[PDB]
Design a binder for these strands. Structure first.
Ligand SMILES: [Zn+2]
Ligand SMILES: [Zn+2]
Ligand SMILES: [Zn+2]
Lengths: 100, 1189, 130
RNA sequence: CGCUUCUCGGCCUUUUGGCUAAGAUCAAGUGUAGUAUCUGUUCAUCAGUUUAAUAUCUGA
RNA sequence: UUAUGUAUUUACUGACCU
């Protein structure tokens, strides 16, 4: 995300699998991470959609509910035509909070 | 300030062309790409012509295009790879007549990048995968399948990435239901860029590489990788599996090579050069086209060298392995970008410059006479297999499809004294180049002539039965002559024919089976074989006015009005209705139309009255002589017509100045009168038949045909004069047509090219015409022709004589000096066989004064061998008197890459007497190529290149008067408004320069901030300058309101001038605009900037009047970017903002696709606009009606 | 006034405003106001607080599409090669954001670079004319 | 001219008044990633290191 | 008088977070 600067994206080739967002993060854009003007569906790679990882949230990794989208401001900057935006690592937040 | 783009005659040059069963039937279709346009063409086999069926604007650059057939499939899907990061697979739906987008998958950022794929596109021949690949580093494989709804599906993109790797071409290796393989010519360059010795990048030969897709393992592996002992440029698929020896031919400079992996030894065949063609100092020879063909017995390849010499390559294999390849000189056509040989034996060639062609293949195979050679015959000493070029033997020309690409220079001028202006166009590359004159009318071609004396009023066209075509008679009357001529040969005045009645006649028609009605003073005739006339028409007195006939039913009037019908009996003779209205007089015209069904009355009555009124009356027996719906007209109609034109009955009145087009439906009459104008003599509306349907020829000062070409209502004029009448025509002398004269003669006409907008007429030229000027006294064109790599014909004659010399010197003892003489006096047409190419750095050039009426070389002046013209201006000096002058900027030894001129010249000519010839005056030298000449205040201004010099005449040579040296890189354009100079740099921009009267200085006082690469420009105001660039944009640079000129002459502002000018539009066109001109295309219209691009297209930029129009069309196209996205996926706002962001220009080619959606989308947009879709289509064609065609 | 102000949180929030405004007025002919405000965004390039450097760099890659890659490439030049590495690497990452953001639109917009002794640096194909 | 007193003005505590049992009671915040700013605090001549340039090391 | 290194609060940022 933009808030947690240590989160890294997957960035491999985007397949045909449509991204999903959890119930806690519905309406969030994936890159600019806002709520308004969703314009373009999320296509995620086949390694980040395999088996146990199907229909899972792009950001949280929770169980997905609705489809994921990019903003218009991510679309017209063509930040959707890079790799798949599946946030891979879980780092330094929601880990120490689990230990707290 | 606020503009609006429209294309008038959209682009015609073809870059890619593919063929296949796109409709889904047995017959085949061509799909071509005009670069920005994607078109479907049907090669109509019986008549041989080529008909366009659909033309869409994809708003991208179609970087590659390829059709594929799904495994066990009927229809082929088109596959488009573009500047968007999108593969997009299209299906031609014939029903709705549009390209249904099947799928659209995103794989990288957009624009014509280097890394993301889209440039090269290969497909598996069975139809299971498709590879889209870039010029560097990365390739993608999609796996195509079909699922249970017989529907196409696409997997995730497989990856075939390979770093530091060029790709020259990629192709589908046929393997019959095996793992699909793709072959590509690669090159790895990392050791070529690591070693500064330079030789490591000199021995870095290509590799043929095969990518095999493990469908079992779902990834792409480099299977084979074999180097090449020469650099191949493109590959050709060989069919295989069961059909042939599966592999890839490799075309290359002076060679063709069959390679196939595993076991085939590499088969080399050196490319046949011509016998002793005079274009080779040292130059190789490549192919440019492939054109495979699978004739269900064997397979062959119609390859093509770069001159145009088509070869018939046939693989003849003794084993399952290949044995040896062999080829022969098939034929020669102009050089093509792509070929599609067709089953049913056609050959379509798409010349990249000039006209496209469709040939019928006459002698396929051609295995009878010709000296064919092969690969594995032990021939040494280079090529050693020659061929003598020859005219056509294997092909016959059938269709010449027209194109304006490349429009190199253009003028809007009215030189031929016509009302509307004309487009004077330079066109073509090389010996196929042409000046082309374009008008707005239609191709009105006369096939026969007669000379009808007196002053005839009218003509009518009638047959024996409804079933024939000969059209047995043709009647012509003014007051007292009937003259119902025989239609065929020996057309001459008639005696009392089998249909003739009396002399003073006024109408005729076929009413019954063979029963004619002819109308005169004692009107009623009814004549089938016996002259069964019953001529009453006497309510006491009145006997002549206003006939109005149909095929089954009649309504005629007398002085009075709503009157008699005078029908017939369906088994017998005529009768009448005695129910009259008698209508206080008021009649100028009546007209009706009849339907193809109807065992009843089955028509509608329209009458036009002397008062400012027309009237429609349904005369069905229930509700007879009872008026139905009312009217409004300003002055007087003088004409009426009813017609049906589609596949709503289109009521066409005409008044004495303007014309309308209503939309009368049969029970209810919702009129919705479309309006348009037509001296202004009263118009006359005559229903004729073209192409299969009917239309109205409405006639005035000039004639106007109003025909519905795919429901578009082209109201296009005619190229002939005023003709005062019209009627239909059919005969075996010319199948359909229009006989149309009320003035002193008689013409049988044909309207041949009927879809298009412009009338091309071409005047052929020798070389590539750079630009031309217009001698304004006694209008004549003065053209400079210039071509790199070309001989001037003095060197052609010397080179031919030299060839003859060494052919009679090289051991002639044993003999044939016949060969040298026959070589000297047999001159091949260079427009047909390709011009010879004079190595490098040679430059042919001539100067041609030409009549723009007949198109004849009124004067021709050659130049020397390397002395190439670049700029021309006619002018009239001030120090000398009235006499004209011609200034021609010439360069010498230019060599254009790397650029090293040897300094140029400026020739001065006098242009005596009327302008018909051209006397030399003097020859001044100059130290860099004078690429811009411009008359200014009785002198000239010459851009030497970084140097702007004023000049004046001397009797020895030209004399400079000023000079400037602060203008940047290179001059390419100079235009003046008077007291100001606009200097177009070749790289930066427009530079304003002031010229002083008291001094002689040239002071730069304004420039622009953007680098632009300006190609041409035009002045619009005293301040603004509209210009265009090499990349495709159009800028308009308006000076700020202050910018005081008075600057007398060290810091600049940003390393430049001080008053930085500013930009008030940027717009992308996709093609290089070469001619911008401010003009008015239709009298009664308004000014509009006219751009003529390089790829043949012609467009306009149109200002908006008021902010309601601007805001309306802005919301229209802002809705259409949402509802109607472009075909390639290329985002329309980010196509028009390709290099610079768009500003204040509304793309009206997106707007005029409002008329191309299904009416659900149209109702969504129109109620989102709060209008109705006919109201929006009216408002949307008002602008094209007003400013343009 | 906000970008002219001393405090850097003002400058990061005004840079976010410049970004969203830059993407909201795109294609409407408002490239004069954004080119005004770019003259105030651009000296914030050297700030090393992470939020303000990502806010101004998002504002620059949002102004790329609004006023053009030409104008952003004009601001990147004469500082890609600057002697200090502290200015050089920041202008190289602004240039990388422009280069990956629009690689093809830069083709018209590059400067002319004259030939040295051994190498040819003039793209001659653009330079010659018809 | 000087001295003491008287009156007017230039003016430097004025907070809502006092009394009861000081009348009587009260007043919760996290974790994470980053910055800015006070206070405390200290700042002999080569050679190469390094830096845009400057400022550690070693040298006599 | 720009300035460092630190002990060190106070303010401030990211629609950060059950
Ligand atoms: Zn976003
Ligand atoms: Zn992934
Ligand atoms: Zn989530």
């Amino acid at each position: 995300a933009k808030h947690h600067p240590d989160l890294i994206f997957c960035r491999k080739q985007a397949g045909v699998a449509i991204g999903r967002l959890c119930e806690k993060c519905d309406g969030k854009c994936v890159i600019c991470d806002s709520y308004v003007r969703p314009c373009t569906l999320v296509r995620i790679c086949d390694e980040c959609n395999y088996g146990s990882y199907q229909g899972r949230c792009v950001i949280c990794g929770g169980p997905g509910v609705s489809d994921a989208y990019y903003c218009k401001e991510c679309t017209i900057q063509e930040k959707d035509r890079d790799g798949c935006p599946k946030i891979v690592n879980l780092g330094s937040s929601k880990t120490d909070l689990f230990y707290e | 300030m606020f503009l609006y783009n429209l294309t008038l005659q959209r682009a015609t040059g073809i870059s890619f062309a593919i063929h296949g069963n796109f409709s889904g039937t047995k017959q085949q279709e061509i799909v071509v790409s005009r670069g920005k346009i994607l078109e479907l063409l049907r090669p109509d086999p019986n008549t041989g012509k080529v008909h366009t069926l659909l033309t869409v604007e994809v708003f991208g650059v179609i970087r590659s295009l390829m059709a594929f057939r799904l495994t066990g499939g009927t229809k082929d899907y088109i596959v488009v790879g573009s500047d968007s990061g999108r593969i997009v697979i299209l299906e031609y739906q014939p029903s709705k007549n549009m390209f249904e987008k099947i799928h659209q998958e995103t794989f990288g950022k957009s624009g014509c990048r280097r890394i993301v794929p889209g440039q090269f596109l290969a497909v598996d021949p069975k139809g299971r995968a498709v590879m889209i690949s870039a010029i560097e580093k990365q390739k993608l494989v999609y796996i195509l399948n079909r699922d249970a709804a017989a529907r196409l599906t696409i997997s995730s993109p497989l990856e075939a990435h390979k770093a530091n790797t060029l790709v020259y071409h990629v192709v589908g290796v046929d393997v019959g239901f095996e793992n699909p393989m793709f072959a590509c010519l690669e090159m790895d360059y990392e050791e070529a860029d690591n070693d500064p010795t330079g030789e490591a990048a000199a021995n870095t030969q290509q590799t043929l590489t095969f990518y095999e897709l493990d469908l079992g393992l779902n990834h792409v592996v480099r299977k084979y990788s074999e180097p090449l002992e020469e650099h191949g440029n493109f590959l050709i698929t060989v069919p295989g599996g069961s059909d042939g020896p599966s592999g890839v031919l490799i075309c290359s400079e002076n060679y063709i090579t069959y390679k196939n992996f595993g076991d085939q030894p590499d088969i080399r065949c050196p490319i046949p050069r011509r016998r002793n063609d005079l274009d080779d100092p040292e130059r190789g020879m490549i192919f440019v086209c492939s054109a495979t063909h699978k004739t269900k017995s064997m397979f062959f390849f119609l390859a093509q060298t770069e001159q145009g010499d088509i070869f018939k390559i046939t693989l003849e294999t003794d084993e399952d392995m290949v044995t040896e390849i062999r080829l022969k000189y098939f034929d020669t056509v102009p050089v093509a970008a792509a070929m599609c040989v067709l089953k049913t034996g056609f050959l379509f060639v798409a010349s990249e410059f000039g006209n496209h062609y469709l040939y019928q293949i006459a002698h396929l195979g051609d295995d009878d006479e010709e000296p064919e050679f092969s690969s594995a015959m032990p021939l040494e000493e280079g090529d050693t297999f020659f061929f003598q070029p020859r005219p056509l033997k294997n092909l016959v020309l059938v269709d010449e499809l027209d194109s304006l690409s490349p429009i190199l220079f253009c003028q809007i001028a009215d030189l031929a004294n016509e009302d509307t202006p004309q487009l004077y166009v330079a066109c073509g590359r090389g010996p196929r180049s042409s000046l082309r004159v374009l008008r707005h009318g239609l191709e009105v071609s006369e096939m026969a002539v007669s000379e009808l004396p007196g002053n005839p009023n009218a003509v009518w066209t009638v047959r024996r039965h409804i079933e024939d075509e000969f059209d047995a008679y043709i009647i012509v009357s003014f007051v007292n002559a009937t003259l119902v001529l025989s239609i065929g040969e020996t057309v001459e005045e008639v005696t009392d024919s089998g249909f003739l009645g009396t002399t003073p006649t006024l109408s005729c028609s076929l009413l019954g089976d063979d029963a004619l009605v002819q109308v005169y003073p004692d009107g009623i005739r009814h004549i089938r074989a016996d002259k069964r006339v019953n001529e009453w028409k006497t309510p006491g007195k009145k006997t002549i006015v206003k006939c109005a006939v149909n095929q089954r039913q009649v309504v005629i009037a007398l002085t009075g009005g709503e009157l008699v019908y005078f029908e017939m009996d369906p088994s017998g003779q005529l009768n009448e209705y005695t129910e009259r209205k008698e209508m206080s007089a008021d009649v100028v015209c009546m007209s009706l139309a009849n339907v193809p069904p109807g065992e009843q009355r089955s028509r509608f009555l329209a009458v036009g009255l002397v008062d400012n009124t027309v009237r429609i009356i349904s005369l069905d027996p229930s509700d007879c002589l009872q008026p139905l719906s009312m009217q409004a007209l300003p002055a007087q109609p003088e004409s009426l017509c009813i017609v049906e034109m589609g596949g709503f009955l289109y009521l066409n009145i005409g008044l004495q100045n303007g014309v309308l087009l209503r939309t009368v439906l049969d029970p209810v009459t919702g009129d919705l009168s479309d309006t348009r104008t037509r001296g202004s003599r009263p118009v006359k509306l005559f229903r004729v038949r073209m192409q299969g349907q009917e239309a109205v020829l409405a006639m005035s000062s000039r004639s106007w045909l109003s025909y519905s070409y795919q429901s578009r209502f082209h109201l296009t004029p005619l190229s002939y004069e005023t003709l005062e009448f019209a009627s239909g025509f059919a005969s075996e002398q010319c199948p359909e047509g229009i006989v149309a004269i009320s003035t002193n003669t008689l013409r049988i006409l044909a309207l041949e090219k009927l879809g298009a907008v412009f009338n091309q007429v071409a005047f052929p030229l020798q070389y590539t015409p750079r630009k031309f000027v217009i001698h304004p006294e006694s209008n004549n064109l003065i053209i400079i022709e210039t071509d790199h790599n070309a001989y001037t014909e003095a060197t052609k004659a010397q080179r031919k004589q030299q060839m003859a010399e060494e052919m009679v010197e090289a051991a002639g003892e044993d003999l044939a000096a016949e060969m040298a003489a026959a070589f000297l006096n047999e001159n091949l047409p260079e427009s047909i066989f390709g011009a010879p190419k004079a190595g490098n750095g040679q430059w042919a050039s001539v100067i041609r004064v030409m009549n723009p009426i007949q198109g004849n070389t009124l004067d021709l002046v050659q130049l020397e061998q390397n002395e190439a013209a670049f700029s021309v201006a006619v002018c009239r000096f001030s120090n000398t008197g009235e006499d004209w002058y011609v200034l021609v900027g010439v360069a010498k030894d230019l060599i254009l890459n790397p650029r090293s001129v040897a300094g140029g010249f400026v020739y001065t000519y006098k242009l005596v007497n009327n302008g018909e010839k051209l006397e030399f005056l003097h020859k001044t030298p100059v130290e860099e190529v004078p690429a811009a000449i411009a008359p200014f205040q009785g002198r000239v201004l010459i851009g030497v290149g970084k140097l702007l010099r004023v000049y004046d005449l001397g009797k020895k040579k030209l004399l400079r008067k000023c000079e400037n040296k602060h203008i940047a890189n290179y001059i390419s354009g100079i235009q003046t408004i008077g007291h100001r100079v606009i200097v177009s740099d070749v790289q930066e921009s427009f530079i304003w320069v002031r010229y002083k009267r008291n001094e002689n200085q040239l002071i730069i006082f304004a420039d622009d901030t953007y680098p632009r690469w300006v190609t041409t420009a035009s002045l619009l105001d005293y301040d603004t300058v509209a210009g265009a660039d090499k990349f495709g944009n159009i800028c308009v640079v308006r000076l700020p309101p202050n910018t005081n000129d008075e600057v007398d002459e060290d810091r600049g502002l940003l390393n430049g001038a001080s008053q930085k000018a500013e930009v008030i539009m940027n717009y992308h066109v996709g093609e290089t605009v070469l001619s911008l001109q401010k003009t008015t295309l239709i009298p009664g219209g308004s000014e509009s900037l006219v751009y003529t691009t390089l790829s043949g297209g012609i467009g306009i930029l149109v200002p908006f009047t008021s902010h309601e129009d601007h805001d309306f069309f802005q919301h229209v196209e802002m809705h259409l970017r949402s509802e109607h996205p472009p075909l390639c996926g290329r985002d329309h706002l980010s196509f028009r903002s390709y290099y610079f962001p768009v500003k204040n220009v509304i793309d009206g080619d997106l707007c005029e696709q409002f008329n191309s959606m299904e009416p659900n989308k149209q109702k969504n947009v129109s109620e989102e606009l709060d209008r109705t879709p006919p109201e929006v289509s009216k408002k949307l064609e008002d602008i094209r009606t007003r400013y343009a065609f | 006034d906000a970008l002219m102000d001393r405090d850097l949180v003002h400058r990061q929030t005004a840079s976010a405003v410049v970004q969203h405004m830059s993407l909201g007025v795109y294609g409407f002919g408002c490239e004069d106001s954004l080119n005004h405000l770019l003259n105030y965004v651009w000296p914030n390039v050297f700030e090393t607080s992470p939020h303000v450097i990502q806010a101004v760099m998002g504002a620059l890659e949002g102004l790329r599409v609004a006023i053009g890659p030409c104008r952003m490439l004009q601001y990147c030049l004469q500082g890609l090669f600057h002697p200090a590495r502290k200015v050089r690497d920041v202008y190289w990452k602004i240039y990388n954001s422009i280069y990956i953001g629009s690689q093809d639109a830069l083709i018209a917009h590059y400067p002319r670079i004259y030939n040295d002794d051994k190498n040819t640096y003039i793209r001659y194909e653009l330079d010659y004319i018809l």
